[PDB]
Prior knowledge:
Chain A: This is Volume-regulated anion channel subunit LRRC8A. Chain A: Belongs to the LRRC8 family. Chain A: It comes from Homo sapiens. Chain A: It is found in: Cell membrane; Lysosome membrane. This is part of a larger assembly, with 2 copies of chain A. With 49 residues, chain A is mostly helical. In chain A, 57% of the residues lie in helices and 0% in strands. The interface between A and B is small, with 3 and 5 residues.
Amino acid sequence: YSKRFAVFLSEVSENKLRQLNLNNEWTLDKLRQRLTKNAQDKLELHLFM
Amino acid sequence: RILKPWWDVFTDYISIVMLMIAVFGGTLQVTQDKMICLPCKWVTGPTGIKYDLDRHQYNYVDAVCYENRLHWFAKYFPYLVLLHTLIFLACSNFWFKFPRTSSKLEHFVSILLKCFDSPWTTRALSESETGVLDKKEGEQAKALFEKVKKFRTHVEEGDIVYRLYMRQTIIKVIKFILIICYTVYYVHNIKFDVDCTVDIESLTGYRTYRCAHPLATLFKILASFYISLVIFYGLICMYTLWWMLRRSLKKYSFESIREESSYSDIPDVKNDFAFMLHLIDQYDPLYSKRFAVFLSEVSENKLRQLNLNNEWTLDKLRQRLTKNAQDKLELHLFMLSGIPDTVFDLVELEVLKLELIPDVTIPPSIAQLTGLKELWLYHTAAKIEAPALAFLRENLRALHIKFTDIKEIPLWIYSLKTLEELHLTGNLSAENNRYIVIDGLRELKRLKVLRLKSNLSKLPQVVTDVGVHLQKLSINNEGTKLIVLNSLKKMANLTELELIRCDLERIPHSIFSLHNLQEIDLKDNNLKTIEEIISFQHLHRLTCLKLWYNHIAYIPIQIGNLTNLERLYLNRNKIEKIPTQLFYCRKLRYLDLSHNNLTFLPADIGLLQNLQNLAITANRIETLPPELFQCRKLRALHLGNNVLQSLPSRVGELTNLTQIELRGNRLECLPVELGECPLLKRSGLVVEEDLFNTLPPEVKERLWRAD
């Protein structure tokens, strides 16, 4: 039980959590929708925050 | 219910120990209490004395001495304890189950438990930041904040809980002092070994009875234990009173709210009643912090702003996209409190309309709308304070600041040096308020169209003439008497000038130097006979002459001087005679003779081969000249509001005549030569059932089979 509490307290793990939310909520098909643009193969994190 | 302080917890447990003593003394007092009595008589060595008495009489003198010569306090000690501790239970139990203020507490703990429960207050307590929640906790926080306001209405810093609490705690204190007085006064009236002397002597023959009570030591020790329990009990009750007079007020916790809020970076928080809040201040200030952080209007303002953000949808603005010229959106006239965030979703938008909104800030993600270039920001005070201004520094070209007062001109916004047209209606500004339009608009070098409409000016600003980039000017709807002559000629790239609703008797003569002038607008002026076209003929580019709403009654001979004139508006003045020299302006495509006093058209109309649309409405012409056929480019035969009678076969000449106007005439003949109507469909205000009765295959088959 103390192992559960400290493991949840670690910043690397919750950092991996929010990065993991951004993983499974920014999928391969999403960048498939964002592939090909004006001159070249341009990917937008442009204006996205 | 779990709001009780610690001393009321001690009141509960000391109370139940106290009644446990009561039921112990009562039970023991019933089944084991008796008295032992035997008479004092005087007042192989040792032998037992004998009495000539009986077991009968011993029980009798037991009952007589036990009832008579024994103290009632020792008789009824557990009953006084039992009834008296139910006074204490009735104090705290009755104070909490008082009906109306108990409803106040029940309502209060219901909103209090939800106020612990709301994870939005975890979020809003936890923190230009973003983050999108779901729907229904917004609804819960809506009606949750509503019921907080309902509680704020029902209480208004009440007094029933304070004075009712104060009355029950003060009767607890004075009852405490009362009973410790007489019980300490009666403990030494409990004795182990009593001396009885009764009227029994004719029945048993003895006066005095040494009587031992075998139980008074037990009642004595638990009586002393009892009052020891009470002095500890009521002593803690005195400590409650000492806090009541020492540190407790009606708004002291309100200062803990607002000093806590200044400590908690959400400063301005209102207040609801503190003494009940003081008891939970004694419970924990953490739960106090949950309550005030929910209470602040900035916080719930942010909540309903997010309710707006997820409760304007893509189908809503999708069904609000395409308008007058382009893709134009409206929060215009809609009194919305905030901009939706799905606004910057849909890049199809080009012209944004934002009347009546309290958004001082715009999100930086609005630059995703790369199609947006025309912006309407009226009845608002958007002072964004974000790096999105650089975003729109290289985006947009049109600004609309209508009906905006002197203070509500967002100053930092006009640094975008790609603005090209400006709309400043409603700057009701004096010369000191003229400087409140601060010259940071001088830096915006790309301003080409300037709108200074609908205000209280008399002279233009000296900062006005610094922009030679300006090509289109309007100074409209003012009290305009005076024009500084140098400022007009300084902006020589002026091509279109607007004098709408001005107090001009005449025109400024210095207009001759503005050789780029093509379009001149003179609506609603006091014009009699005009300044010479010798001035206008120096204006070589003059093509558009707009002479609306004057009271000039005669046109000078120099009208046959503007060859480049194509658009002539002579609407609503006192013109009666048609000047002959109208024929020379052969580039004339539109002739406006409307709202005059006209008699008859001379033959100058036939030489106007470029005439496509003719307006002679609101006149007094009765018969058209035969020069109708030479106006072969005529599409709009605008013949309204006259005393006209009929038409010749010249109507069949015009191959591009599409619309005919006869707004109130004789129109009795309804001629058949309309049935040679090669492209026309709508003789618009000629439409009557009379003309629809006449010419059956021509009107009905040509028009109604053409439709």
